[PDB]
């Protein structure tokens, strides 16, 4: 048996199921989701280079601390990957989540002070940006064009050999807090792969489920939809229930099992374990915050945590409705009444609601806007919850990405009025602030940089009053310890479907008629 409960079926795939499995993979190819072998080989080469830079880095530190040559050559140091790349389900151009593990005499200070300069001196490295203040400290860069998100963990051992595995829970003892967090992603990815009956079947099924979720716009953790890890664990759970199936069957059965699931019963890939640390483990019977989780997807590595903390009543409802819809499509696919492409039809978010909320973050520099827009976006789920409590609002559906604009205002007064939400007729251009700021590094108008998020409003059966929700949200954002009242502002507006700007419809997409 795989997983905690008995399988639904152990039968081999039928001939028809095998044929639909080939058709599924053909549609994933049709969607161009597989990178070329050349790009795959380039990723292996980049990871091999990072492993050599890691050994060089650890050796340099060891020698600077007066270790002898022999011991400095034994200190080791190892690169790991996790996330989509490690799971083997990543699209062309995707980032590699990467972790460097080092022995106890190499510190997080050496990471940013010693390894960072070593990367900057490589001709293959571009777009290098260190972010030591993040929740998980990180160094971001491209190596030969491959995007790397590099995090760091120091172990309490004198040597990190090339064959080190991170599964033993005791490896967490004596490790600093941020290093324990940096180890979790790799420990989680490895366990998921170990807990499914057939890794090849799991990967194809996850690729389809992930693409479906992105096409339906229910793939963003920050606003309360499941993220990559959460979708991966959901697919893994279904794989456990069909240990002898092919990917077509996993996908076809996935939707109904999960929208009929007895929420909030958790998705667990294995029993929750205890460990040698003194840290909280997910437990609704001890912690009220864990009891409030609506669709808990629990990570299997000690210490277990819920990967879907952010889900609200609204996003729970959207997720379930999307699964109901997909289950009925999959039913038709598996009797050959519809092609697989029918499952991947894009959302109609900007066609389906009569009333939207626009939430705009604005700033006077692109660099300030990037952090401020991120902050405002991260608070949307709290606005969603308060909007639900408005008697007239049944559901507040957040879209899963923001839209960047730049206004080239003619005066400081006009720029102030644009940033505060008195954007009348002032012209703007659609842009990408992240690309602008990065271009500036690699290098009278008063520009205002804005990022707008959208919430679709489902109103109760029988003008809307959102005064308190709006006031509460402004105050929550402006409590940010980095909020700068000379640079940043935020405003909410009501927007009818007919008033949606052209930006929200992709190139060649017709507006609602």
Author numbering: 14 to 456, 475 to 493, 500 to 550
Paper text:
To first gain insights into the inter-domain arrangement and interactions between the NTD, MD and RRM domains of Pla1, we determined the crystal structure of the protein in its apo form. The crystal structure of the full-length protein shows a tripartite domain architecture of Pla1. Briefly, the N-terminal catalytic domain is homologous to the catalytic domain of other nucleotidyl-transferases forming a five stranded mixed β-sheet along with four α-helices. The middle domain is formed by a four-helix bundle which is capped by the N-terminus of Pla1. The C-terminal RRM domain contains additional secondary structure elements extending the canonical βαββαβ topology of RRMs44. It comprises additional helices α14, α15 and β-strands β8, β9 in the extended loop L1 connecting the canonical RRM strands β7 and β10 compared to its homologues. In our crystal structure, 18 residues of loop L1, loop L2 connecting β10 and α16 and 25 residues at the C-terminus are disordered. A large interface is formed by a network of interactions between the three domains of the protein burying a total surface area of ~2982 Å2. The tripartite domain architecture of Pla1 is held together by hydrogen bonds between the interface residues of the domains.
The S. pombe orthologue of the human PAXT connection, Mtl1-Red1 Core (MTREC), is an eleven-subunit complex that targets cryptic unstable transcripts (CUTs) to the nuclear RNA exosome for degradation. It encompasses the canonical poly(A) polymerase Pla1, responsible for polyadenylation of nascent RNA transcripts as part of the cleavage and polyadenylation factor (CPF/CPSF). We report crystal structures of Pla1 in its apo form and in complex with Red1. Taken together, our data reveal the molecular details of recruitment of Pla1 by Red1 which leads to hyperadenylation of CUTs, serving as a signal for exosome-mediated target degradation.
